[PDB]
Amino acid sequence: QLTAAQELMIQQLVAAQLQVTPWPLGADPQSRDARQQRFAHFTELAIISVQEIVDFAKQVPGFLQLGREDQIALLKASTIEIMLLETARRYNHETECITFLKDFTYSKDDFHRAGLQVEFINPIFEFSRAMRRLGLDDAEYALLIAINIFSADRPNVQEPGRVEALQQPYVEALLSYTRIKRPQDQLRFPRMLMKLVSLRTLSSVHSEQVFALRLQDKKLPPLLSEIWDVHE
Ligand SMILES: O=S(=O)(c1ccccc1)N(CC(F)(F)F)c1ccc(C(O)(C(F)(F)F)C(F)(F)F)cc1
């Protein structure tokens, strides 16, 4: 059985989880004006998502007690990975579109028309399509977010000991949870850790997509730029 502490920590995350430039209509796929506007649109959706991630992290117990520089370091690293997880969760399997809201849904072709390369687009969609087999519930997703946030090995983490100590109870709860819910499925926890490694890969692919965009004279807005731009 889940302990009182584990029930509590999960409830807290599950509760915490609870709480734009228009697409250019009918513009040529090749239009440089329109590719820029399609890009700007994604950019603004991304900014909404990061604010959500910040506001979530702030509610996770212990996060706000970390030094200010660790808070930023953890958030800089996990932002895109949490975004990708959330993208997977909302992904429409019938229509093959990542779903931001209700009528805000995007296919591989929509991303390609925004200037993105199939090298980035194909993986994000395969990751989303693949997550369904896992069949994660709300408690499992939230646990995964929290464990992603408290990764002691991110660039520029100054108190990784503290960070790992915060992560541990969440890893323990997730293991217990999958064991209780799917006792016959011994590969389930490994499957979850596998998604955590794919998220690292995808995060790197995203970073290169960002750089590639800069080479096409496409610049992120200041908020995203501070998270994702390379600079020497
Ligand atoms: O799901 S996203 O976060 C997303 C962003 C905006 C609108 C819908 C969906 N996303 C795809 C991913 F699968 F990676 F999560 C995504 C994130 C970031 C980007 C970009 O960083 C930017 F600039 F658009 F925000 C970039 F296009 F550069 F890659 C693009 C798509």
CATH assignment of the domain containing 120: 1.10.565.10
Distance between CA 202 and CA 45 in Å, rounded? 18
| Residue pointed to by tokens 């591989």 | 108
Total count of domains within the chain? 1
Helix axis angle, 138-149 to 4-18, nearest 10°: 90
Per the structure block, which two tokens stand in for 210?
């960002």
Q: How far is the CA of 46 from the centre of ligand 1 (A)?
A: 6
Using CB atoms within 10 Å of the CB of residue 21, give its burial: 0 to 12 exposed, 13 to 18 middle, 19+ buried.
Answer: middle
Please tell me the residue having the least CA distance from ligand 1 atom 4. Answer: 46
Distance between CA 133 and CA 136 in Å, rounded? 9
Residue 155 DSSP one-character state: T
The parent domain of residue 33 ranges over 1-232
**Residues whose beta carbon lies within 6 Å of some atom of ligand 1:** 42-43, 45-46, 49, 83-84, 87, 98, 100, 106, 116, 124, 206, 209-210, 213, 220, 224
109: how many CB neighbours lie within 10 A of its CB?
A: 12
Q: Which atom of ligand 1 is nearest to the CA of 202?
A: 14
Closest by alpha carbon to 61, among 137, 5, 129? Answer: 5
Contacting residues for 4 by C-beta, under 8 A, at least 6 apart: none
| Residue of 79, 80, 87 best suited for mutating to test ligand 1, as the one with most atoms within 8 Å of CB | 87
146: how many CB neighbours lie within 10 A of its CB?
A: 30
121 with 108: CB under 8 angstroms? yes
Distance between CA 228 and CA 211 in Å, rounded? 9
* Bridging pattern class, strands 98-99 and 105-106: antiparallel
**Cα dist. 4→1, 9, 33, 177, 180 in Å?**
9, 9, 56, 13, 15
Q: How far is the CA of 4 from the centre of ligand 1 (A)?
A: 38
